[PDB]
Design a protein around this ligand. Structure first.
Ligand SMILES: Nc1ncnc2c1ncn2[C@@H]1O[C@H](COP(=O)(O)OP(=O)(O)O)[C@@H](O)[C@H]1O
Ligand SMILES: [Mg+2]
Lengths: 370, 214, 141
């Protein structure tokens, strides 16, 4: 027995937290730690060397930004502990961690040590009554309400196509690549450098991320738009200066469909989806093609749906209906799924209890997650 | 919860029943709902402290067992009354409003109050008219035999009462212990030394008639 | 609690109006000193950081224990609660001094219970039972 479970979808880009049963995640904030890089000289300056959440965004020019997660894998565990502490602070969730079961999310095919260390942190440092490390794609499909389909979740750190049959994620058909929104923004930074506009600072990488979110689109025909004269839309920087983007506007999100633009010999996002579908059973391929669900932030590019549909039709067999679903709540689909799962009474039978972790350890999460 | 108590006081002063809407935006406050749910968890713990009670049938006399079961029924009905009170129902309704269904479903089922009430009511026919008061008050061998026959005539009603066979057997052992104590006390007062042998034969005839009835 | 009371007083309209009036008169000495030299922010941070360890300490169970098994269980609870120090930023030397103090309380409680036991008066087997219970308490420690 414990309080209402707390859902924490910890992405590489932004963490989304709330209590189970809420319609949307009420507590969303970027997943980075900001530390001041300048010299504090006077009394009355900003307090604390660690800035997380909207306090980091308000003073963004003052801070060096560090991302703990990279490609869905926690690289700095002290920063991850700080961020999860902030999730429980008086600014977010206003509650003690010793009272609420947690439903953490983890991207598929992650390292085992990542899940083990996450459970160790959540059971030792935060002393949670219970824990359940879920997978993002199956939760997104639960949020959509369907039971069978393919979830092509493309987040900040990792993109992956996961087919689910009657609620069970087929584990031998999961396709994953590490090219995601952060890679697209790094590519955009490189192209802006090739256009004369140079950004170095970790705080200016957030300006590059904003440029990606604001003025970038996917052209239906890359070669046709490539040869034509560009329009050079102008973007207003935070300081008031302007920059003319031009060809970098559409070649930056092209990285999702062509990783070879950065020398990676990995599949494209359309190839990820189609190979996940074609690696599954021959009986399920028709219903998997007829049920494709987009998710994550990187699926919000202008013209993403039409471009992916064209690519999948190019790769898919003929006489097979293709229906890519792009719900409005793509950013919070996986969190809404975690909230739906945690509301059920069956979730009581799913979590690893605190005593179970105390007596077993990593094996408890290893059997219970799978 | 103090806030629920204050709102109940306010709505009773107006001569109206309480409602979820009387709290307004406080129903959407996550901290308030978390406090209510923690209180409901505490209530579940306290109710489980009572509904999980049991007593070893070997230890203590049969009167102790019957008193324990009757008091268990008396406390379970009191808890059932307290669960239906306006304050508890209002707390549950508020928690249901915020989609905190875990607390409400647990309070319905996890308490075990329904199972405990069903079992204690199933035990009711045996404890309702258990006639050991006559035996414990009996001071003559004829009255002891009559009380024993009544005790077993009442134990005849165990067919339509759920009871463990081993527990009923230990209860019969307790009845035997009480019979032994009563016979010892009665025969102690007879002062066998100050009376003749024919009355001794009568007394032992009555005692062994009681034993054959047993 | 006292620091929370002081903070609540600081946010009251009277204090804010006084500081605003002093700012409008360019009397920045008092306002800057009030903002910085109080130490209220650092004290609030420290006590709030320490609160999880101090919140609901089970020391009373050790102080109210009158039997050796109860003392052992209270010690288990006390050390399980002291394991919460990781979440805080409590000084470790201060934690060791707190452990010293908990040892002092354990010694006092054991002395009280053994004084009620009257060890030398009772038979030897009862003495051995009390001794093995006490040494189980020490092994638990
Ligand atoms: N409207 C948008 N257009 C393009 N990219 C976006 C948009 N909104 C968010 N993003 C990108 O999506 C990423 C966040 O996606 P999200 O689903 O939060 O990932 P995660 O699963 O790691 O939480 C960010 O890196 C951001 O660059
Ligand atoms: Mg995600």
């Amino acid at each position: 027995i414990a309080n209402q479970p707390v859902v924490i979808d910890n992405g590489s880009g932004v963490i989304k937290a709330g209590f189970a049963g809420d319609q949307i995640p009420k507590y969303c904030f970027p997943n980075y730690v900001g530390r001041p890089k300048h010299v504090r000289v006077m009394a009355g300056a900003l307090e604390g060397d660690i800035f997380i959440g909207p306090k980091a965004e308000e003073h963004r020019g003052l801070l060096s930004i560090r991302y703990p997660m990279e490609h869905g894998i926690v690289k700095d565990w002290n920063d991850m502990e700080r961020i999860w502490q902030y999730v429980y602070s008086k600014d977010q969730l206003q509650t003690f961690s010793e009272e609420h079961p947690v439903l953490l999310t983890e991207a598929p095919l992650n390292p085992r040590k990542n899940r083990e260390r996450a459970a160790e942190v959540f059971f030792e440092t935060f002393n949670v009554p219970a824990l359940f490390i879920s997978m993002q794609a199956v939760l997104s499909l639960y949020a959509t309400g369907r039971t069978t389909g393919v979830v092509l979740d493309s987040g900040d750190g990792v993109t992956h196509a996961v087919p689910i049959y009657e609620g069970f994620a087929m584990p031998h058909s999961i396709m994953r690549i590490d090219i995601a929104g952060r890679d697209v923004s790094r590519f955009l930074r490189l192209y802006l450098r090739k256009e004369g506009y140079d950004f170095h600072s970790s705080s200016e990488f957030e300006i590059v991320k904003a440029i990606k979110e604001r003025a970038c689109y996917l052209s239906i025909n890359p070669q046709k738009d490539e040869t034509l004269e560009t329009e050079k839309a102008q973007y207003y920087l935070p300081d008031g200066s302007t920059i003319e983007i031009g060809p970098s506007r559409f070649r930056a999100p092209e990285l999702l469909f062509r990783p070879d633009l950065i020398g990676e010999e990995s599949e494209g996002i359309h190839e990820v989806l189609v190979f996940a579908i074609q690696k599954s059973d021959m009986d399920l391929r028709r219903t998997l093609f007829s049920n494709i669900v987009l998710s994550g932030g990187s699926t919000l590019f202008k013209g993403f749906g039409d471009r992916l549909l064209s690519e999948v039709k190019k790769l898919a067999p003929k006489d097979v209906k293709i229906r890519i679903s792009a719900p409005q709540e793509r950013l919070y689909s996986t969190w809404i799924g975690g909230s739906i799962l945690a509301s059920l009474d069956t979730f009581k039978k799913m979590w690893v209890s605190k005593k179970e972790y105390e007596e077993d350890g990593a094996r408890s999460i290893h059997r219970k997650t799978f | 919860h103090p806030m629920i108590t204050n709102v109940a006081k306010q709505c009773y002063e107006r001569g109206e029943k309480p409602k979820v809407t009387d709290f307004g935006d406080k129903v959407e406050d996550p901290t308030f709902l978390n406090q209510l749910q923690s209180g409901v968890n505490r209530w579940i713990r306290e109710i489980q402290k009572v509904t999980k009670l049991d007593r070893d049938p070997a230890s203590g006399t049969a009167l102790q067992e019957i008193s324990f079961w009757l008091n268990l029924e008396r406390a379970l009905y009191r808890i059932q009354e307290k669960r239906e009170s306006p304050e508890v129902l209002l707390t549950l309704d508020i928690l249901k409003h915020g989609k905190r269904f875990h607390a409400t479903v647990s309070f319905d089922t996890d308490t075990g109050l329904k199972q405990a009430l069903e079992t204690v009511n199933d035990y009711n026919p045996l404890m309702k008219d258990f006639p050991l008061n006559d035996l414990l008050s009996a001071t003559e061998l004829d009255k002891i035999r009559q009380a024993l026959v009544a005790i077993f005539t009442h134990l005849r009603k165990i067919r339509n009462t759920k009871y463990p066979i081993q527990r009923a057997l230990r209860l019969v052992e307790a009845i035997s212990r009480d019979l032994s104590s009563q016979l010892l006390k009665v025969l102690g007062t007879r002062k066998l030394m100050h009376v003749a042998y024919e009355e001794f034969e009568k007394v032992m005839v009555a005692c062994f008639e009681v034993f054959q009835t047993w």
